[PDB]
Amino acid sequence: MKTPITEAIAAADTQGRFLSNTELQAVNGRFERAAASMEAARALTNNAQQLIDGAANAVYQKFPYTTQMQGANFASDSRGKSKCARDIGYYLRIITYSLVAGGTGPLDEYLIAGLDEINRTFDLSPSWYVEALKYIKANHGLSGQAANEANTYIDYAINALS
Amino acid sequence: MKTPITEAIAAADTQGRFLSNTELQAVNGRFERAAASMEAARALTNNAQQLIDGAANAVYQKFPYTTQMQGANFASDSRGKSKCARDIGYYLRIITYSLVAGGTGPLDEYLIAGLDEINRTFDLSPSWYVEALKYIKANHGLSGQAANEANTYIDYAINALS
Amino acid sequence: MKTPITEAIAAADTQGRFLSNTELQAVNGRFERAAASMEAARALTNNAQQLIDGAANAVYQKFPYTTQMQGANFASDSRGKSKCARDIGYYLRIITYSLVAGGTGPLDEYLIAGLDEINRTFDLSPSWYVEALKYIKANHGLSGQAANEANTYIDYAINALS
Amino acid sequence: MKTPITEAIAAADTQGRFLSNTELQAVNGRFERAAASMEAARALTNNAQQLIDGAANAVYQKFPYTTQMQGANFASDSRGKSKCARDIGYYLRIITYSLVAGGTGPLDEYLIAGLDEINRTFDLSPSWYVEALKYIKANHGLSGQAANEANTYIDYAINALS
Amino acid sequence: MKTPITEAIAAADTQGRFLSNTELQAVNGRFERAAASMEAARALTNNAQQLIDGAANAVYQKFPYTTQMQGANFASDSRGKSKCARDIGYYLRIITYSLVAGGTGPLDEYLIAGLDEINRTFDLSPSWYVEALKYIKANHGLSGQAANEANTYIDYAINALS
Amino acid sequence: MKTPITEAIAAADTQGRFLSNTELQAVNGRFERAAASMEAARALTNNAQQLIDGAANAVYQKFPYTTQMQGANFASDSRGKSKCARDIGYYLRIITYSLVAGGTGPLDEYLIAGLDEINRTFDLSPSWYVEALKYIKANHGLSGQAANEANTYIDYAINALS
Amino acid sequence: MLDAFAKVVSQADTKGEFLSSAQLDALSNVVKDGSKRLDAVNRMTSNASTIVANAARSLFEEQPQLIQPGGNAYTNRRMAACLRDMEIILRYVTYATLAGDSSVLDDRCLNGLRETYQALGVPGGSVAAGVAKMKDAAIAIVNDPNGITKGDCSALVSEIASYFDRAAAAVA
Amino acid sequence: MLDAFAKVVSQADTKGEFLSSAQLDALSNVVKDGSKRLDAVNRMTSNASTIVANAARSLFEEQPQLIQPGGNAYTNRRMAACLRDMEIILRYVTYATLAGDSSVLDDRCLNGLRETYQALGVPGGSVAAGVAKMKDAAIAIVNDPNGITKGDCSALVSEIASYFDRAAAAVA
Amino acid sequence: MLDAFAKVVSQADTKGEFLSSAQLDALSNVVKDGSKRLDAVNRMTSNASTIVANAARSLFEEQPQLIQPGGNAYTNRRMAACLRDMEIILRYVTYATLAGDSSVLDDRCLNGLRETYQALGVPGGSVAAGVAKMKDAAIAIVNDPNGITKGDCSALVSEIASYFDRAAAAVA
Amino acid sequence: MLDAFAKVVSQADTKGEFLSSAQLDALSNVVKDGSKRLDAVNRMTSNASTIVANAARSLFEEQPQLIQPGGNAYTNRRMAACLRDMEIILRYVTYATLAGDSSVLDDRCLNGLRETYQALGVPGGSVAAGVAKMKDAAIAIVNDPNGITKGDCSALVSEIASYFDRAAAAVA
Amino acid sequence: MLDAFAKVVSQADTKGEFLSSAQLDALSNVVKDGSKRLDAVNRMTSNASTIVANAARSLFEEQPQLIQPGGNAYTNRRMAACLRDMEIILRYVTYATLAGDSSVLDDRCLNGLRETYQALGVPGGSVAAGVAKMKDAAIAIVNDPNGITKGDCSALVSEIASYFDRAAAAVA
Amino acid sequence: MLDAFAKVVSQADTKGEFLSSAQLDALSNVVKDGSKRLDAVNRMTSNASTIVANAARSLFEEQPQLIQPGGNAYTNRRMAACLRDMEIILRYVTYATLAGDSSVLDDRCLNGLRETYQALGVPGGSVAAGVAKMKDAAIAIVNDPNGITKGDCSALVSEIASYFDRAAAAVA
Numbered sequence A, B, C, D, E, F: 001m002k003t004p005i006t007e008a009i010a011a012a013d014t015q016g017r018f019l020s021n022t023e024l025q026a027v028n029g030r031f032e033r034a035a036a037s038m039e040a041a042r043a044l045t046n047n048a049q050q051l052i053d054g055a056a057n058a059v060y061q062k063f064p065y066t067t068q069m070q071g072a073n074f075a076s077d078s079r080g081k082s083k084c085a086r087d088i089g090y091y092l093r094i095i096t097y098s099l100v101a102g103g104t105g106p107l108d109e110y111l112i113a114g115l116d117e118i119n120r121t122f123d124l125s126p127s128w129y130v131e132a133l134k135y136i137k138a139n140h141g142l143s144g145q146a147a148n149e150a151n152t153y154i155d156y157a158i159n160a161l162s
Numbered sequence G, H, I, J, K, L: 001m002l003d004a005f006a007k008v009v010s011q012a013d014t015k016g017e018f019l020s021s022a023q024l025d026a027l028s029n030v031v032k033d034g035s036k037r038l039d040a041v042n043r044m045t046s047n048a049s050t051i052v053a054n055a056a057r058s059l060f061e062e063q064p065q066l067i068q069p070g071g072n073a074y075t076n077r078r079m080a081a082c083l084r085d086m087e088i089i090l091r092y093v094t095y096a097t098l099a100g101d102s103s104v105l106d107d108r109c110l111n112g113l114r115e116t117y118q119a120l121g122v123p124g125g126s127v128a129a130g131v132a133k134m135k136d137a138a139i140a141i142v143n144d145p146n147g148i149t150k151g152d153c154s155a156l157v158s159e160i161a162s163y164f165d166r167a168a169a170a171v172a
């Protein structure tokens, strides 16, 4: 899993060498940033249900056909609404994982790898999830560098869908 | 040249990726460490001639044959003494480069690559340069993290000679 | 470009051999089938404008939000409707090329390669183009093996979008 | 084994794709040619002993030394005559296999691979087998496309010996 | 060109190392064999025309169909007899080159590479050349180790034809 | 193990071919040289202990600091003197192996591979062993090509240390 | 790889025999029914995306443990691998249908697949359930009389079903 | 490649000299301004998809000959290549921004690109127009006073603009 | 590579146009003469060994300096390479004949062959003479009325001759 | 590989759960003690040559059969391989110390090492003895109170000791 | 690989011993008989084609089931492989004869060959019968008193026979 | 590559001629002087380290700008490359001496080296000066009358000198 620590070790290991002071500085940078990352993770976790429900309603109001049209890929029935809220919770949960790990590893491994294939196969529009992520960005209530950390990983997911 | 910044870019470029916060945290780690690194670099530079002259004397006293035996690899004449003091100055100067760059890049590129070949070809004993480096470590007069920085790169050079 | 003839030649060339009856039989099969393929290509060409405009309006009727929602990816203005009719004409024209060439080469090279990347970047829904292709399949007016030829390449494009 | 059908599947499989109409036309071409190929196969099979005996006689008359010189590679005794008639029967039988399979596969796998090695090792002259094949071509009694099919595979064997 | 000297150099060069006594011994072995090799080379050269004429006549005597049968590959006319005597002279000349060079290099490069292809393409029987070589072995008049040298390269060519 | 015989076999085996006269001459060169090589091996073996004792004393006399300086890498106590005489005996014994095998194989495999790593890791100076080898060259008492054989392999080890 | 014709040829070569009149008759009937075989392959291929997607969806509805967190098909990378496997098996079934012989399916797809799934922890029994769903959908598509010249495809349908069943048995 | 620190070190080594007190002061100032540099890289990276897509869309609106049939960016494969080139140039510009030195952009992206485009027939002048559009969008994003501590980034912005201008000049 | 059909399609795509009735009629004529085209390929292929060997023999008879010691085709290795080149050129000419387009011959055989021959010292003019001999033999074989349904292959023969001439011109 | 943070994430994802307040508090303590962890890695790395050499020397003193002729570490090539193994194990122990997790050590160094040693004839029990000597030396270096801010590193030291013990148990 | 000299050296090195005067005398006798050894290798090599062909012919005469249709050496591809195996085994026997040691034959030819044949279905007992025929022919050629200085080669002939017997035992 | 014998053979084959009695005599003289040639190669090889080291030391003493900071041989990596080039050229000179022909030196060392040095910025004139120093040392070693049977090696020394001069001219 990609974290600043595993990335430093992989760099040294590729080269058959001990960790050098370059890699140790990188890990200390991760330790100093962790206070902001963990503040964001706690706030997103504590408000997770409201963020998920609000994000889903944002998508339904931006794309009202998703609650109107018949289809296994749509949220016009309880099955589809449950699928959608589930997916949005996956995004939020794995974003908090990335904040805790200090890198994109969790998003890369658990969600982004295979993302395009899944959206094509099940006819899910990436624009739906971009809108959900924009809602979370606008409503997490963070400021300072904790907001910077949350927005960086939200924007990372948006770019993967764009 | 291997620095924390070029190492961050190389990691992203190998994967065809934009930089992520995994790498930006690494670079901020280098920024936070720079104050200690630059304090060490300034002290070693300001006292360079005295460190070089003292280190050379320390080697001559530990290995008296190096000022007596008349081969080209020894310092029995002014030519060999000038070569030796030059070499020790190279070590000290490139150590300050590594402190300023924030990584082993300068030592790796300018000195350590080919080092074993050169010491074998010209019949130079690695133990001579280890003794010079131990003198520098014992006499740079630093404390705190500035000494940590200086000693880390001195020890890096000693390990390359061992 | 992949045709039954170029595939036959490529098969022999990869093995550094002359063509055998194994490949000449395949090319004769292509010659036999050309009557059905060309009947389809002529009918689609002769009715192209009617099919293109009908297919575009079939998309607008299935997905009315594409004519309501504002944004560069939608057909709520004259610019967007012209883009959409243009795209559908591209599909139909390149399908006729595939019929004439007797293979998927034209669709593979001119349209399908890069298709997923383009739909993601420009926020275009594959379901829109599937619906246009379904309309063309339902309205080309062909029968027999000419209809089989037309539908095989239409379905090939639908699967590439799915 | 190389047939028009296995070639079609191999082409799709090497590209990791479903069969397309490009390959199905190839297989239909094989189906349409089968009538002529099977007609030739039956005619050669039902006249096989007469063709084999006549071909062997044709070789012995063209190359009289083969029935006189007493080495193991020649047919001066019943042992060598039996080997020779056996070999000619191998050619004819495997030619009928190629007609039935619709491709050179049986000739390539059962006879031609290793052929040069064997003729060199056992000191057998390719010209002997060319003459036997020329006899079969001159005496199969076929017409039309059945003759074309038989002659194509006989000529394929002649080229492998030349 | 493969000689004991060029293989010694190639062995060192493949390994990026200076020549050792491992290779110098090989070259001295070539020097000590040269007395026998050159004795053979001078005798074959001094008797070349009589050996070539006798070998050609020996081939025709063993295989008299070669002076009887019509065809560009046979010696039934002045043109074919000149081709045959020319070929046999090539064998003898290049055998003397191999004796002089101390290795199979000249035979390998000038004659054996592509030999099988040529005999097949032009319908030349390897057995003809084997008989020419057997005549030369039986009539070069050499004794002792000079005969051993000549017969070793003659047998080398016979094996290349078998 | 590299000998003139295994090199000859390796050359043939790399090309998948029988041994040729090119290689048999090389092996005879090894057989002829063995008279000198084995004479050298017997003389070094018969005088092995006097040569080892004398070489060790010659190293100490040239580099008397090795009997004086404290450290595990020096011969300033009984343990270090025993290690040094052991090492010198290894060099002499493996030199006799190379003479017996007619090649550098034993020196390459038993001593030279990893030599630089060991001298660096254990802080052993190559110049010490060069002086031991120069003593052996000056004192083996051989003449003629037997002396040439001994001195060639002694010089081979000296070059490996230089 | 063998097709129906190469299989009979290979058997006859092992006995050193010309093909018999009955063996030739049987291969001529393969040619006679060849148009129906081409339709069957075209129809499965032309519907491959929906065959895979509908079978996968139904499998996950019946077996939600496959897609809950910790499940074998949870995360998009593992779901993508699962959908790929369904498409791969369908692809090689269509290859075997064109060939009239299972050798390509056995040799390039099924041989070693059970061992591969066991090393990975893929539930082979659940894969077999998905394969059976693709079978039922593909057969319904092949054997639909609309939009095709009417005739009997029952022997071809049984052959195709046997290839699906062979794939399911290779992983269950 | 070189960053801002390796750049000074390499020049000093060629002269065989320790860094001067003034050179250390200048490098210390690079460190002090480092947080703003990280913001600029993060902001450009976090908006990469829209920077590329909006610039590409505007380029094609202004130059419809690029996308009409026969145009260099016609067909989805060539359009995908064109979009990829835009993203590549932006990517290497953000690398240069992190390094504070253009070497990674020159050595790994721009060197030989004009000759590559000439062999292909890619209109380099049109690429340069697209690069200029990405520049304007990226600078506006970096300069946005919302959601960041207010301060002076004008030197950084001029440096970033110079990297974009360097890329456009390499292909025009 | 292109065949006759792909060539017309490629030209139409560059213009963004459907094929015209005249273009479709022309391609229908390629189909209508397809059986003759298959005969031409089968006949050249079935006589490939004699076409090459007879042409090489005649070339060396006219140009003995090619095979005398020191000649370009002297030694069996160089003679084998020379015979191989004749076979290669004939092979790609038969490919172009099947395709009804010279692109495969131009792209995979003739492009850069002159420069290859100049670097090696192969006499390209002598290669061209051998190619012309293969042309004359192949045309006589293709256009032999024995053992074939009688008809007019003159247009096909002219096309085949143009491919041989194109090969000879690429090396002369 | 996993570090201490990735390990907790991986377990939470398998359960489909957000991290609890307690799990976040625990990881914040890993960060709080991070400077000590960096000191431990730096101190072991900065003394790696002497840690390896002193342990190897002591091992050969206790087990002279390893270096006598016919011994597993006799000849300079096998001695160099033995020294390399000691360095490799120490290197991966320092990796695990930085990560706060043994996974990189287990996955890349220890897994399969016993069977490798058995195939080669390397005495793994003797390797384990060397590893234990490196452990004792490394711990004394990490615990050295000179030249460092005074504090408690006992939990860190126990963690490092467990990595050494894990390596020795994997080869014995 | 080892030759006769390297084998003694390797055994001595394992014991840390100089070669004894008796070991040196034994190797001097290998040198003394070296000319006879070279003749034996030259004679087998110079007759390699007939040794292989005559042994194969005799084997197939005695075991016609090997070449009848369905037999392991039926078809020219399998016959070529069989003849190749005979040549390979003879080749490595001549290598061992030059070396005075079986290591090259064991390491590069015989080790794993039984298992290779068993996986393929090659009848190893029949290969062993072919090897024994090559042995008898090769020994008769080596022992031929014509055209050579008369002397005793019995020890060398026994050694050569032992290598052939080793190969036959490795595949039976 | 060619040795002295292969060069004469190659020239004769180009003319299709047997070697003349004078050419055989000349090659017999190469054999006659072979012992001296072996001594020359052994002597240069046995002193290779000092030949390279002494020539490099003298070159740097005469041209200090090569090793001062900024110089082409400054830093240990470039110095190692420079020493390697000296050893490479000496190695190929000894090869040419063994072969009695410069072809291996020209083909594998000298051809294209001048262009290599110009692209890198290596001062070829300084390399030539180092090569001439190796020449003088190697010649003195070859002509040293101590420890060798006394005789005339003047023609061999002139040949060796010509190879060194050839290398120096190739880089200057």
Ligand SMILES: *[C@@H](C)[C@H]1/C(=C/c2[nH]c(/C=C3N=C(/C=C4\NC(=O)C(CC)=C4C)C(C)=C\3CCC(=O)O)c(CCC(=O)O)c2C)NC(=O)[C@@H]1C
Pocket (backbone or CB within 6 Å): A033, A144, A145, A148, B021, B024, B025, B028, H032, H033, H034, H035, H036, H037, H038, H039, H040, H042, H142, H143, H144, H145, H148, H149, H150, H151, H152, H153, H156
């Ligand atoms: C010009 C680009 C705009 C701007 C820049 C600006 N930023 C800051 C202050 C901070 N920026 C950061 C960002 C990071 N630190 C890291 O380690 C990482 C990677 C994970 C990032 C992205 C931080 C931590 C600070 C300090 C805390 C804070 O929020 O202030 C400043 C302040 C001056 C300074 O150098 O600290 C400025 C000026 N401000 C503008 O107005 C421009 C639009």
